[PDB]
Design a protein around this ligand. Structure first.
Ligand SMILES: [Zn+2]
Length: 133
């Protein structure tokens, strides 16, 4: 991570199945150094939440209430909820990542494999973040 670029605007995420633009890297936050989410209102117009009892569960710091999928049907991630706040969690394996100016397409299995550093919000910062921003 020390040689990563802390410039998320360099990348865009496309659904690996239908190629639709899911979001810019600028719309991603990492939560408690683990979960990569997109909490913007615009992103909510692009996914559907469906039931998936294999993935739903109650955790100490969040609950998983469903699976997030693209309008085309391709799974994208999970719907986490922390203290009533929605955390749409993206699994990088469901997307194609495009880097600007070089426009080269890439696929990854884990977020740590993508050499980009994103802004972090610990769980303890979420209520404040949603109240103000
Ligand atoms: Zn799709």
């Amino acid at each position: 991570a020390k040689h990563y670029k802390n410039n998320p605007s360099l990348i865009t995420f496309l659904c690996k199945n239908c190629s639709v633009l899911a979001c810019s890297g600028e719309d991603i936050h990492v939560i408690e150094k683990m979960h990569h989410v997109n909490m913007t209102p615009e992103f909510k117009e692009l996914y559907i939440v469906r039931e998936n009892k294999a993935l739903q569960k109650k955790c100490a710091d969040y609950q998983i209430n469903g699976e997030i999928i693209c309008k085309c049907g391709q799974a994208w991630g999970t719907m986490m909820v922390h203290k009533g706040l929605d955390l749409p969690c993206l699994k990088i394996r469901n997307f194609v990542v495009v880097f600007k100016n070089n426009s080269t397409k890439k696929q990854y299995k884990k977020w740590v494999e993508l050499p980009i550093t994103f802004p972090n919000l610990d769980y303890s910062e979420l209520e404040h973040h949603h109240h103000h921003h």
